[PDB]
Design a protein around this ligand. Structure first.
Ligand SMILES: Cc1cn([C@H]2C[C@H](O)[C@@H](CO)O2)c(=O)[nH]c1=O
Ligand SMILES: Cc1cn([C@H]2C[C@H](O)[C@@H](CO)O2)c(=O)[nH]c1=O
Lengths: 333, 331
């Protein structure tokens, strides 16, 4: 009933950069600042709650394909389904929490009563990782469209912080984390890194008032060469003034989505319209994570004066605290 | 200068005559006030991409029921095809949802504009997935993944679930064009039960009850439950349903409970979401045992009972364009 000001932050980016550790420090009292709740990756939902481990499954699918115990056509389909299952616990969490944030989104500049830090936004599993998989040829455009369509609309007041890190230190971090001689999917990481820069650029692009049709006619179709560039290490970066070719929209200009005359079908244009509207309420930032976890938390926290806050109330904030405790407990190990 | 809109989602098991009814309703030959029809997105499912999902989901069961494909793999691939059914619905729903307007009310009048949607997103995100789960073609994990993608219906929705006696249903299924679709009676029986569960869920919610109401007392829905749900006429429309008569009952399974037998909070959230998303669907059923003209008349008799919203002229014009576009690209 009593009013509460909330900043919510979705910390996102490529696996292995130090996002989860940063988020945990933010939530720790030792980092000071605002009282903060942290919602971890839904690890148990992915790995232990059901019969199948989707993380093992998605990586194992590609191995079964390369050796030849599973056909390429079948593998593409199984990969898409695994990618679908990644999104589930994010969609559930989003549906539960979006009722509690309240409205009256504004950039207030002041310190909130409390901060929420979500480990990833639903865009990670519905858009970024599917896009990476599509660009690498592990699943089709059809499958991509199917995941992208399931991106939920962000209500007013969202902030997304995309984590960045020089690639040498990124791979170092993955290396220390990995077992004795464990390989790292460098090609996947290179692509995901570009996809997250595309995401950042997309949000910047929309905030400048531009739309996916702006520069669409003039854009080259995104066939073999676009895909090579998209998997190329450091090919994309955060742009000051991004144009269409720097954003997620560019990959959708492929023959698969055009009529004979090369015009996008209207149904596909509607999908891009939906994608555009769903991302509108995301106030976008980027954060370098080269420092210590304490330093990383401070870098993110120092963004709060530029972030959107909403006005919730004590009962809803209390429900969010209960939600965080429940999600931390149930999603553990 | 408001435009009064009544939107109808005609839904139910395939083969019952729903699309024919919808076309008749929108046909100028049937007169009335201006009516638009949005067909099943057949081209999206069948021809727009390299794979046809209707033959693909059937073919998958065939490979399973033979050499080609292992049952674990078939279950994942079947879930993927089921996801692909939802896509054009999600896209259409995202495009039209802001156009309907607010001020949902049962006004009892003829609307300025009637919209007939062939199926609601619930069909592909919940009903067909649930049938596949109950039949053992998909896991509960796979079902949860589809169910979580159901979009929230904004105020003013009406759903008309079509009904038909088993004998006429079987007769009509035999009339259908050959498109490589699965057409067995155990599937039909299950879909009919699941659509009764859906109607009952809507009645249950409108009665002022929530899924926890009767949850504790409800038997755990494991192997026996699944068998019952595949039995022709195991379920029916009840305007005063028990929890066991709704879609909620199939979620009280071991897979979703802790060791103490209490549903996990995360799964409880998924039921809350389902409950909330169905809130704005005013539910009706219509028997389609008449002729195409008779069927349309039965559905039209429901209009004065339905919710209408108030939209502006530009929004209505855009809905008019959207039906034109959709018919053009989906056929
Ligand atoms: C969020 C997400 C993670 N992952 C993988 C990357 C990591 O190996 C692991 C945890 O982030 O899951 C996906 O493959 N797809 C996804 O959508
Ligand atoms: C909407 C829908 C239809 N179908 C099938 C039933 C019919 O064979 C055909 C057309 O409705 O597609 C599904 O298998 N899943 C779905 O979600």
């Amino acid at each position: 009933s009593h009013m509460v000001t909330i900043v919510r932050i979705y910390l996102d980016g490529v696996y292995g950069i130090g996002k989860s550790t940063t988020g945990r420090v933010m939530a720790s009292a030792a980092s000071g600042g605002s009282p903060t709740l942290y919602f971890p990756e839904p690890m148990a939902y992915w790995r232990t709650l059901f019969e199948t481990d989707v993380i093992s499954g998605i990586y194992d699918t590609q191995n079964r394909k390369q050796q030849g115990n599973l056909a390429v056509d079948d593998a593409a389909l199984i990969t898409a389904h695994y990618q679908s299952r990644f999104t589930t616990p994010y969609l559930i969490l989003h549906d539960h929490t979006c009722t509690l944030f309240g409205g009256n989104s504004l950039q207030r500049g002041t310190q909130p009563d409390l901060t929420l830090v979500f480990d990833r936004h639903p865009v990670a599993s519905t858009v970024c990782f599917p896009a990476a998989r599509y660009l690498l040829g592990d699943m089709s455009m059809c499958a991509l469209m199917a995941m992208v369509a399931t991106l939920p609309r962000e209500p007013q007041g969202g902030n997304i912080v995309v984590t960045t890190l020089n690639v040498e230190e990124h791979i170092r971090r993955l290396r220390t984390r990995a077992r004795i001689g464990e390989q790292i999917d460098i090609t996947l990481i290179a692509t995901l890194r570009n996809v997250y820069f595309m995401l950042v650029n997309t949000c910047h692009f929309l905030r400048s008032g531009r739309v996916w049709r702006d520069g669409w006619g003039e854009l080259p179709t995104s066939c073999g060469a676009y895909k090579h560039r998209a998997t190329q290490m450091d090919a994309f970066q955060e742009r000051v003034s991004p144009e269409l070719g720097d954003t997620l929209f560019a990959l959708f200009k492929t023959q698969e989505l055009l009529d004979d005359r090369g015009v996008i079908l209207e149904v596909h244009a509607w999908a891009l319209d939906a994608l555009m509207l769903k991302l509108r309420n995301l106030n976008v930032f980027s954060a370098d994570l080269s420092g210590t976890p304490r330093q990383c938390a401070a870098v993110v926290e120092s963004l709060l004066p530029l972030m959107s806050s909403t006005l919730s109330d004590f009962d809803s904030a209390s429900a969010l605290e209960r939600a965080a405790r429940t999600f931390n407990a149930e999603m553990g190990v």
